[PDB]
Enzyme design. Structure first.
Site, mmCIF file in Angstrom:
data_model
loop_
_atom_site.group_PDB
_atom_site.id
_atom_site.type_symbol
_atom_site.label_atom_id
_atom_site.label_comp_id
_atom_site.label_asym_id
_atom_site.label_seq_id
_atom_site.Cartn_x
_atom_site.Cartn_y
_atom_site.Cartn_z
ATOM 1 N N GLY A 166 0.802 -1.207 0.000
ATOM 2 C CA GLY A 166 0.000 0.000 0.000
ATOM 3 C C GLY A 166 0.837 1.260 0.000
ATOM 4 N N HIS B 243 8.979 -4.706 -4.008
ATOM 5 C CA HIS B 243 8.420 -3.750 -4.953
ATOM 6 C C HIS B 243 8.854 -2.328 -4.627
ATOM 7 C CE1 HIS B 243 4.742 -1.648 -6.807
ATOM 8 N NE2 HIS B 243 5.448 -2.127 -7.815
ATOM 9 N N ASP C 228 6.073 -3.203 -11.457
ATOM 10 C CA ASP C 228 4.658 -3.448 -11.202
ATOM 11 C C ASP C 228 4.251 -4.854 -11.628
ATOM 12 O OD1 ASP C 228 4.543 -0.884 -10.224
ATOM 13 O OD2 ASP C 228 3.310 -0.073 -11.845
#
Lengths: 121, 121
Positions: free
Chosen positions: A29, A47, A89
């Site tokens: 998030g 990520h 991504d």
């Protein structure tokens, strides 16, 4: 941006990216990084460290193109920064799919009371 | 911060802020602005223009103190930045409550089903 990232997560995992990963663990998030709780959290850790190596584009706001061919995310040619961002991504969307087996509903919120300070990428 | 903003929306509307507004329309939740689709969408558009005026604090991360008196959100005295941030968050919660009657569940998804470029703040 989230338009591409959230779409990749939807395509790979089938989950609502905002509700399922908007605040998962210490790394999924917004609100940055932290020592990962589980395998799902570790994907988001990977990520965000991918993002941090990118400085010539803005992962938060920059748009880019990709397509869905044979049920696989195929990043388009953009420029190198945007193509590098597309690959970050794509990697996390596949990672989250592969660790759905251990996704734990226990860790979906915004105070992060037990998250430790993460090590440098 | 996100904690106070979500808590306010819950207290005013009675809805799960993330599930109901995390991706509503073109302006609610997910980063970015656009031409509002309805009144609920417009509440979040005004809210994001509210945030952009602030530079001395971080709206997403910085905590502030408020209270619940006479079933009313009452912002504490903070500094001028955190006070203005609390008043922005208070106004968006009230506005979403006011426009619940036209809440359109066709509109709570994050890919920005296609929004037009918003007018300047």
């Amino acid at each position: 941006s989230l338009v591409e990232l959230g779409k990749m997560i939807l395509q790979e995992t089938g989950k609502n990216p905002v509700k399922s990963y908007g605040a998962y663990g210490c790394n999924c998030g917004v609100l940055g990084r932290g020592k990962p709780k589980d395998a799902t959290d570790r994907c988001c850790y990977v990520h965000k460290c991918c993002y941090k190596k990118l400085t010539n584009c803005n992962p938060k706001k920059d748009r880019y193109s990709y397509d869905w061919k044979n049920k696989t995310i195929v990043c388009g040619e953009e420029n190198p920064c945007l193509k590098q961002l597309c690959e970050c991504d794509k990697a996390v969307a596949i990672c989250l799919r592969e660790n759905k087996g251990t996704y734990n509903k226990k860790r979906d919120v915004y105070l992060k009371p037990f998250c430790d300070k993460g090590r440098d990428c």
